[PDB]
Structures are given as C-alpha cells and as structure tokens.
Amino acid sequence: QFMGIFEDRAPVPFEEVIDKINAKGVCRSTAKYVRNNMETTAFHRDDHET
Amino acid sequence: RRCPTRPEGQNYTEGIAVVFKENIAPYKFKATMYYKDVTVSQVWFGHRYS
C-alpha cells in the first residue's frame, strides 16, 4: 500500500541545460535543487548518477 | 418625346424557409463517475497534542 507519494517539479540548472541537454542530448539522473529553503537532492532508482 | 415606362417589377417566389447557423454548442450527455477517495493520514501523537 502507498502511504504517501511526494511529487515535485524541480528545475534543471543552467549548467545542465547547456552542458548536458543542449550539448550531449542527455540529462542527469540526479535532481539537485532548492526547495523550501533547503538543498534537496534526488537520485533516480536510488542509484548512482548517470 | 417617348415617355419612360415603369419596370415590370421583380417576380417574387413565395415560400417557407428554415435558416440554419453553424453549431457552436457542445454535445452534452449524462455520465457517471465511480471512484474511491483513499486517504492515508500519518499522525504524530505528542505529549499533550496530536
């Protein structure tokens, strides 16, 4: 049973839009952003950055 | 001089008419929505409060 599903929309930083998405066509598997005055990081599948 | 003559006049065709305009009203029908509100509440019970 789901006891909770926190869904959020994080921005993609400038250094990822240009260096990753626009340059290589890829996106990082980690979302590092600022939410509620706090540095929050999320790892996809709780795995390493890819 | 040769005096002018009155025009014979337009020949009118008596009839019954129905005027249709472009339809803009959406098509409406009755539907039934079946769902379930699933609410999971996480409560921390303090010394005096919840």
Which one-letter amino acid corresponds to residue B8?
E
Q: B42 to chain A: which residues are within 8 Å by CB? A: 3-4
Neighbours of A31 (CB within 10 A): 19
Please calculate the CA angle A41-A42-A46 and round it to the nearest 5 degrees. 135
DSSP state of A10: P
β-bridge mates for residue A35, sequence order: A38
In contact, A43 and A49? CB cutoff 8 Å: yes
CA distance A22 to B27: 45
At A27 the three-state DSSP class reads coil
| Secondary-structure percent of chain A, ordered helix, strand, coil, rounded to 5 | 25, 25, 50
Closest CA to A49 of A33, A18, A28, A35: A28
Residue B50 contacts A, CB cutoff 8 Å = no
CA distance A25 to A23: 6
Closest CA to A22 of A10, A12, A32, A11: A12
Entry resolution in angstroms? 3.1
Structure-token pair, residue A23:
């340059």
How many angstroms separate the Cα of B9 from the Cα of each of A4, B6, B16, B43, B49?
84, 8, 22, 91, 96
Residue B17 contacts A, CB cutoff 8 Å = no
Residue of A nearest to B39 (CA): A3
CA distance A19 to A14: 8
